[PDB]
Amino acid sequence: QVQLVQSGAEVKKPGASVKVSCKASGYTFTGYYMHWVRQAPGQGLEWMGWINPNSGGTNYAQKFQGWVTMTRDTSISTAYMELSRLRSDDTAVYYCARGGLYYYGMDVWGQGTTVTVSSASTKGPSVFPLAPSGGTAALGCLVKDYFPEPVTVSWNSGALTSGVHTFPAVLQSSGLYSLSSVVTVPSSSLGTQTYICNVNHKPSNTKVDKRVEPK
Amino acid sequence: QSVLTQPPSVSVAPGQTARITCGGNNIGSKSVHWYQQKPGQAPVLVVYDDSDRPSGIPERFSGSNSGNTATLTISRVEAGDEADYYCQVWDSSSDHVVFGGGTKLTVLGQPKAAPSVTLFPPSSEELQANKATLVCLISDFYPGAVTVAWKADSSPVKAGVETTTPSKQSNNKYAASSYLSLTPEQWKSHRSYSCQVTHEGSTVEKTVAP
């Protein structure tokens, strides 16, 4: 199927530079113009510019000209966008989109790349089990004080998916994140069933497993 | 010369017809595209070249474009049509792509849901580690506005409170969470702490004790 897959979320210090990638598959990468559009948290879509994947020519909205640089590698059907001298205000989700050979809109969009501009340092999470207090019970896991996003939580190495609610992380005042995962389970299961929340924070190379037992 | 205007919001009863406009100088001679964006997903092209639908977009979505106003029209509105909608043109006289400012579409009439509150106390493991976190989990509420207040022995606490802004769940209701931070002595010094959640004039409280 026609598809655009963007590189993973990145974090950078103010004044640094980031380069984001956009991998296309399922069509002739050199036939359509590639666009980049930004969406800062809570904001509308903002067109940044286009690149001709075939020739390399670029055209920029006035707001983005100069400190945004679009390139491409025909080899791996990958487009690149670079932001220079980053500012805290540049924290946003960045999308590449296919459009124009004769323009019929942007029919294919990548999943978006999050670029966060911050001075905090990579920090692995401390993980804490939230023991349960009847018909159902709520047992959980606390993923505390980590940077950056994201972390992944599964239960019992993936065997447990029903009743799992993993909440969006909070960005504390400290600069660090925290997030909780809770699973609803039958009260007859406690003391009988093992509950383990698998936490993975790739940026700090941290994998942790915690047994969550009744009090 | 190059500004696209949309109403910032439109709201509509279910089953009714919604209409979202896109204003522009001679836009009727330009070629207008529309995008639908639901929360946390990437925009989707729903209408292109004024009025064509890409495959997979149902006919309830139609489009029009004449004079200085283009119109996206959504027939037989469902709650699943709630989203932001952007219009867009390529401006030939500048080779720029321009988006409209976006329209919030609200489908009125979904029913109220009080939040479920779950509250966890610090664990012994956190305490031995100088953390102690109170965790308040708030789920399944509609609509998505809420105030969270922490109490320590009936007295308000504002220090050490971190709260998320509400987010839509998969079931199209909302979630949010609040964390309180305190020292082990602060935790051990009171009879109780409370996570107090108010939603649509009603308050739901959960309380925990050492």
Please name each of the domains of chain A with its CATH number: 1-119 (2.60.40.10), 120-215 (2.60.40.10)
Tokens read off for B13: 């009863």
Question: At residue A40, what is the residue type?
Answer: A
Please judge whether B177 and A129 are an interchain contact, meaning their C-beta atoms are less than 8 angstroms apart.
no
Method of elucidation = X-ray
Q: Which CATH class is domain B1-109?
A: mainly beta
Tokens read off for B49: 């070249």
Closest listed residue to residue A144, CA positions, set A195, A196, A214, A206: A206
Taking only Cα atoms into account, the Rg of chain A, rounded to an integer number of angstroms, comes to: 21
Tokens read off for B190: 């009171």
Q: Are A22 and A96 in contact (CB under 8 A)?
A: yes
Contacts of A214 (CB under 8 A, 6+ apart): A131, A132, A190, A191
- CA–centroid distance for A144 within its chain: 18
Closest listed residue to residue B87, CA positions, set B124, B50, B39: B50
Q: Are B101 and B85 in contact (CB under 8 A)?
A: no
**B-chain residues near A111 (CB < 8 A):** 42
As a whole number of angstroms, the distance between CA B120 and CA B115 comes to 16
Closest listed residue to residue A22, CA positions, set A117, A92, A111: A111
Q: Transcribe B114-163 into DSSP letters.
A: PPEEEEEPPPHHHHHTT--EEEEEEEEEBSS--EEEEEETTEEE-TTEEE
Residue A111 contacts B, CB cutoff 8 Å? yes
Q: At A62, is the secondary structure helix, strand, or coil?
A: coil
Q: At A114, is the secondary structure helix, strand, or coil?
A: strand
The shortest CB-CB distance from A182 to any of B84, B118, B129 is to: B118
In CATH terms, B110-210 corresponds, of 2.60.120.10, 2.60.40.10, 2.40.50.140, 2.40.340.10, to 2.60.40.10
**B-chain residues near A99 (CB < 8 A):** 97
Please judge whether B35 and A45 are an interchain contact, meaning their C-beta atoms are less than 8 angstroms apart.
yes
Domains B1-109 and B110-210 share a fold: yes
Tokens read off for A166: 């993993």
Tokens read off for A192: 């009988």
Burial class (CB in 10 A: 0-12, 13-18, 19+), A191: exposed
Find the angle CA(B123)-CA(B124)-CA(B129) to the nearest 5 degrees. 100
**Pairing of the two strands A170-171 and A196-201:** unpaired
Cβ atoms within 10 Å, residue B127: 16
User: Across-strand partners of B74?
Assistant: B18, B61
Distances (CA, A) of A211 to A102, A126, A140: 58, 14, 10
Closest listed residue to residue B138, CA positions, set B181, B186, B176, B190: B176
As a whole number of angstroms, the distance between CA A57 and CA A69 comes to 11
As a whole number of angstroms, the distance between CA A25 and CA A2 comes to 6
Find the angle CA(A98)-CA(A102)-CA(A105) to the nearest 5 degrees. 40
DSSP B164: P
Per-residue H/E/C for B13-76: CCCCCEEEEEECCCHHHCCCEEEEECCCCCCEEEEECCCECCCCCCCCEEEEEECCEEEEEECC
Residue B110 contacts A, CB cutoff 8 Å? no
Q: Name the residue ranges covered by the structural domains of chain B.
A: 1-109, 110-210
DSSP B165: P
Cβ atoms within 10 Å, residue A169: 18
- CA–centroid distance for A213 within its chain: 31
